[PDB]
Amino acid sequence: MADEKPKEGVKTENNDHINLKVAGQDGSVVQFKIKRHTPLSKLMKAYCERQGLSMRQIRFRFDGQPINETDTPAQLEMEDEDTIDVFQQQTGG
Numbered sequence: 001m002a003d004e005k006p007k008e009g010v011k012t013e014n015n016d017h018i019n020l021k022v023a024g025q026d027g028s029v030v031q032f033k034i035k036r037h038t039p040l041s042k043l044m045k046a047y048c049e050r051q052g053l054s055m056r057q058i059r060f061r062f063d064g065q066p067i068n069e070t071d072t073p074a075q076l077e078m079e080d081e082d083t084i085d086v087f088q089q090q091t092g093g
Contacts, residue, residue: 018080020073022047022060025087036074044069047086058088 004016017035020043024030030050034043040060048055060067062076062084 018073018078020078021081021083023083023085024051026051029083034073037072039069040067040071040073041069043073043084053088057090058086061085061087 017033017038019031019033021032022030022043024047028051030047032043032046034040034046044055044058044060048058055069062078062082065076067076067084
């Protein structure tokens with residue numbers, strides 16, 4: 001899936017995508033890489049696949065505020081190698 005290959009002349013700031021982490025309520029954390037313009041949809045699924053749980057049964061919050069899969073890591077301008085808190089709330093079902 002590393003089919004991203006620009007013939008650009010990047011010299012000063014060689015950056016593209018950043019690393020993120022998701023801490024689960026179980027005390028485990030996953031380390032992954034996501035692009036700035038890449039939707040959290042893949043993020044939520046990535047962690048879900050790793051931990052072996054349902055994304056519909058969990059929630060993601062960052063910096064005190066909640067984030068939906070429809071948001072991007074650039075939308076709130078998070079830092080590289082930052083972490084997101086995950087909690088699994090079964091309420092009413």
